């Protein structure tokens, strides 16, 4: 292959996420389970608030919610840093500003723990407005289709990483969010750094009709360019 952590994804991935949650004081946490492909680049998950109903909206936190499934292609597997960082795996940091509202603050974890993909999510949000897009539960139950940026960062063996989420509101138009994402390793070992590429990403977001507990499954498909 191409490095050593790439060898981890060439089978279906089961995946766990974790996440403690607060945002202008209101405390959640969530669970979430499934799995990746990263061979196709698919994952599939569900995720339930397991302390009542989360106080902001589920698209909110799509992007919170696990980019070493990302598919790189043949000729790009030299660039898959996310792989690389495996299995110790990576920190992955990230501010995201609502436009003309407030902030989350996110700290995660991606690492093998078992056989099993783990992200391991803290957030904080701050400064948002009672009756604002996120607090105001304005957004539509849907995601549109991204392209995140992704540059290589030779002073952490890490990658910097910048793109911006379009949030349908209710009312048509599109509530902006954007990215400011860090990745550093977790191991010492050499990692791969990329030629500045893009990741595509298609999302789609439905319910489980048999589960009467808040939640979201998410169907995310995600490609390297």
Same mark, same amino acid.
């Given at each position: 292959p191409m490095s050593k952590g790439e060898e981890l994804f060439t089978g279906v991935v089961p995946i766990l996420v974790e996440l403690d949650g607060d945002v202008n004081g209101h405390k959640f946490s969530v669970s979430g389970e499934g799995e990746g492909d990263a061979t196709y680049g698919k994952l599939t998950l569900k995720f339930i608030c /397991? /302390? +009542?109903? $989360?106080?902001?909206?589920w698209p909110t936190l799509v992007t919170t919610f $696990? %980019?070493?499934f990302a598919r790189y292609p043949d000729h790009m597997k %030299?660039? *898959?840093?996310f792989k690389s960082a495996m299995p110790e795996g990576y920190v992955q940091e990230r501010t995201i500003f609502f436009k003309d509202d407030g902030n989350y603050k996110t700290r995660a974890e991606v690492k093998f723990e078992g056989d099993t993909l783990v992200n391991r999510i803290e957030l904080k949000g701050i400064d948002?407005? #009672? *009756? +604002?897009?996120i607090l105001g539960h304005k957004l539509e139950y849907n995601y549109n289709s991204h392209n995140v940026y992704i540059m290589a960062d030779k002073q952490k063996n890490g990658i910097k990483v910048n793109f911006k989420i379009r949030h349908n509101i209710e009312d048509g138009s599109v509530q902006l969010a954007d990215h400011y994402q860090q990745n550093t390793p977790i191991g010492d070992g050499p990692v791969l750094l990329p030629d500045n590429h893009y990741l595509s990403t298609q999302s789609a977001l439905s319910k489980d009709?048999? #589960?009467?507990?808040d939640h979201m499954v998410l169907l995310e498909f995600v490609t390297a360019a």
């Open positions: /397991t /302390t +009542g109903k $989360l106080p902001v909206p $696990l %980019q070493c %030299q660039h *898959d840093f948002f407005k #009672e *009756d +604002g897009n009709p048999n #589960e009467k507990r």
